[PDB]
Design a protein around this ligand. Structure first.
Ligand SMILES: [Ca+2]
Ligand SMILES: [Ca+2]
Length: 400
């Protein structure tokens, strides 16, 4: 929807701190006519209150060989988060100013160590390392973006738990450190805690992977999300080493029983949906994968007692290998066959059309089912999968 008429962008708060790029100490933040600085607002803000950002660019100065990270160590409370949002559903871009060739170890853009933060309509770009690095818990990132950073767009690690990433984008992240073999779009990986979730997100044109859940035994849930064109060299790097997977759903033989539904992967150099040596069974229901190096790659061993669960998935214009799995009602087994005519559009340029100003993904014809497709009502009635008609349609999109 269009929330441009709402000053606080959908947020209910008891106190507003008005902030602008030119905000300073001669102001109290009582309105946009007397805006305070971001740092001043950060010092004053308490649980349940809101740092309201005037739409624009907030530039953090760069100094060669030095980090310029903003640390979010204060905490909100349950039912009283600390809100940080661009006004009138606009955009607030935090530019950390790092030159393309430069990077600093641990120089994140946003370092979130505290709990119960709620970000909306904010972007992080040109950070010296990860755009956002989250070790705190119960944080929310809604209608945010992390792009052109020197490492992974947004990463959750070192105990970070119960974090929710809603309608957010991560793109064009590349690490000069390892020639692109590290920077992902979203990285809920390694030592992250439980309960981390991604819904309505898009990750594209990152040097390494779209989403990466490497070496974590903690279950991650990914819903209604996109991962495309990862692993492509847009940086003129003669030694490029990006892997190029869409959803990298595991790693290092960690047992991670992840769940991914109604999601889309296309145009990735390697695998659209990737087991990546996860030793645990992954749940993959109602997804669509198109023209990747490999559409679904689950051809590695799992630990005894583990088994993947695949239902209602679509593969088109690339191969599928799904072993060690309970699989049926997919386009490559007992479900109906998928071909180009089953889709209204395969124009991939539609994938990055603008979201609504409230964050809602654009409604386009890309990968939507044609009216005469046999994929309609052809799926199994899996628990917690929404549908119209008699049964779920095969793939990520219900024909409505
Ligand atoms: Ca990666
Ligand atoms: Ca249906």
């Amino acid at each position: 929807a269009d929330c441009s008429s709402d000053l606080t962008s959908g947020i209910s708060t008891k106190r507003i701190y008005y902030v602008a790029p030119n905000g300073n100490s001669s102001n109290n933040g009582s309105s946009f006519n007397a805006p305070m600085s971001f740092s001043a607002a950060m010092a004053a803000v308490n649980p349940g209150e809101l740092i309201l950002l005037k739409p624009g660019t907030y530039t953090i100065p760069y100094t060669q060989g030095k980090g310029n990270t903003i640390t979010f160590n204060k905490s909100g409370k349950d039912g009283a988060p600390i809100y940080v949002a661009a006004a009138n559903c606009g955009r607030a871009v935090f530019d950390f100013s790092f030159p393309d060739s430069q990077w600093v170890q641990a120089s994140y853009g946003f370092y979130v160590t505290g709990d119960y933060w709620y970000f909306k309509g904010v972007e992080v770009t040109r950070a010296g390392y990860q755009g956002a690095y989250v070790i705190g818990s119960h944080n929310t990132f809604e209608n945010t973006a992390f792009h052109h950073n020197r490492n992974t767009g947004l990463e959750i690690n070192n105990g970070g738990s119960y974090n929710t990433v809603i309608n957010s984008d991560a793109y064009r992240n590349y690490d000069p450190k390892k020639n692109g073999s590290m920077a992902d779009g979203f990285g809920p990986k390694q030592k992250q805690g439980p309960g981390n979730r991604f819904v309505g997100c898009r990750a594209w044109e990152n040097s390494d992977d779209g989403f990466d859940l490497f070496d974590s035994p903690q279950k991650v849930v990914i819903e209604n999300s996109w991962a495309f064109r990862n692993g492509i060299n847009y940086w003129n790097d003669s030694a490029f080493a990006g892997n190029g997977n869409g959803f990298k759903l595991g790693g290092n033989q960690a047992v991670g029983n992840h769940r991914i539904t109604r999601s889309v992967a296309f145009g990735n150099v390697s695998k659209g949906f990737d087991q990546n040596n996860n030793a645990g069974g992954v749940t993959v229901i109602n997804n669509t994968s198109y023209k990747n190096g490999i559409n679904y790659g689950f051809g590695s061993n799992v630990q005894s007692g583990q088994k993947h669960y695949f239902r209602n998935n679509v593969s088109l214009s690339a191969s599928v290998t799904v072993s060690n799995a309970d699989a049926k009602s997919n386009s490559w087994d007992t479900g109906p066959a998928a071909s180009a005519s089953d889709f209204v559009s395969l124009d991939t340029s539609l994938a990055t059309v603008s979201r609504d100003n409230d964050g809602t993904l654009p409604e386009t014809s890309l990968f939507r089912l044609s009216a005469n497709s046999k994929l309609i009502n052809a799926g199994t009635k899996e628990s917690n999968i929404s549908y119209s008609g008699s049964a779920p349609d095969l793939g990520a999109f219900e024909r409505n």
